[PDB]
Amino acid sequence: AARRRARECAVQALYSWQLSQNDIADVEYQFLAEQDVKDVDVLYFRELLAGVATNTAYLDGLMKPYLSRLLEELGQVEKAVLRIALYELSKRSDVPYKVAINEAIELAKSFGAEDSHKFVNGVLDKAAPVIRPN
RNA sequence: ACUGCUCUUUAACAAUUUAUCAGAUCUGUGUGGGUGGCGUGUGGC
Numbered sequence: 359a360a361r362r363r364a365r366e367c368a369v370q371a372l373y374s375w376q377l378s379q380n381d382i383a384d385v386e387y388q389f390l391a392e393q394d395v396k397d398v399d400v401l402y403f404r405e406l407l408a409g410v411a412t413n414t415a416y417l418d419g420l421m422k423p424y425l426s427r428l429l430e431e432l433g434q435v436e437k438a439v440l441r442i443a444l445y446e447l448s449k450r451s452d453v454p455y456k457v458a459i460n461e462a463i464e465l466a467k468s469f470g471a472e473d474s475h476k477f478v479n480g481v482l483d484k485a486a487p488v489i490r491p492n
Numbered sequence: 493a494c495u496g497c498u499c500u501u502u503a504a505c506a507a508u509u510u511a512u513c514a515g516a517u518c519u520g521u522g523u524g525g526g527u528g529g530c531g532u533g534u535g536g537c
Contacts (some may be wrong), residue, residue, distance in 0.1 A: 362496060426501050436502080456497040463499060473502045480501020 361452075363397035365442055366465040368406035372438040375410070382410050409445050417444040417488070424484040426477045436474050439466045443478060447489045455492040 367389075375385040386407050389395070398406075421444060422429060432440075443462035446452070453461065459482060463475045470478075486492075 359495070433502080454497065458496095459498040461496070461498095464496095467499085471502055475499070475502095477501045479498060482498075483501080 360397070360399050361402050362461065362465065364399055364402035365406060365461065367395050367398040368403055368409075369435075369438045369442055369466060369469070371407065372410070372441065373434055376434055376438065382407050405450065406442070409442065413448055414441050414445055417441065417448055420444075420488060421481055421484040425481050433471065433474070435469050436478065439469065439474075440478055440481075442466070443482065444485055444488070447491060451491055455489055458489075 371382070371385045371389045374389065375382055378385065386403065390403070395403075418429070418441065421440075425432075427436075439462065443459070443466075446458035446462060447455070452458070459479070463479055467475055482489075
């Protein structure tokens with residue numbers, strides 16, 4: 359509940375920067391000093407903000423075609439949760455396929471449009487050939 | 493050291509009972525506008 363609830367708090371900073379176009383350092387400083395968030399472990403916050411590496415844009419380019427909803431109309435909350443759900447095993451692979459998938463779908467279940475997690479899980483079929491440690 | 497192991501492919505609708513044949517006017521800035529109340533005292537006649 360310390361590394362688990364970590365991601366459901368850094369998705370906030372991710373979306374925040376995405377709307378603000380600031381630096382990730384700015385948004386992380388403001389998020390931490392904004393509310394004392396202990397559901398995230400500080401180092402896992404550091405890892406999730408390192409989850410703004412260029413490869414993240416890359417995991418947007420791979421799963422681009424087989425998206426049941428187009429890129430230039432997807433919700434920013436969906437953009438962030440998608441980046442995280444694909445990055446869970448881009449390099450980190452802290453937990454295997456099912457664990458990280460369920461993590462992304464549930465700990466971000468309370469942010470979508472009542473159905474978004476369905477289609478993000480459905481696009482996760484295109485996530486298979488890059489999430490190899492099944 | 494010893495919770496976590498895919499939930500399966502982005503919204504799921506309101507308007508609704510006679511009656512219809514759709515069926516004259518865009519003027520101002522002519523003109524003025526832009527000491528006193530009371531008390532008391534003093535005198536006078």
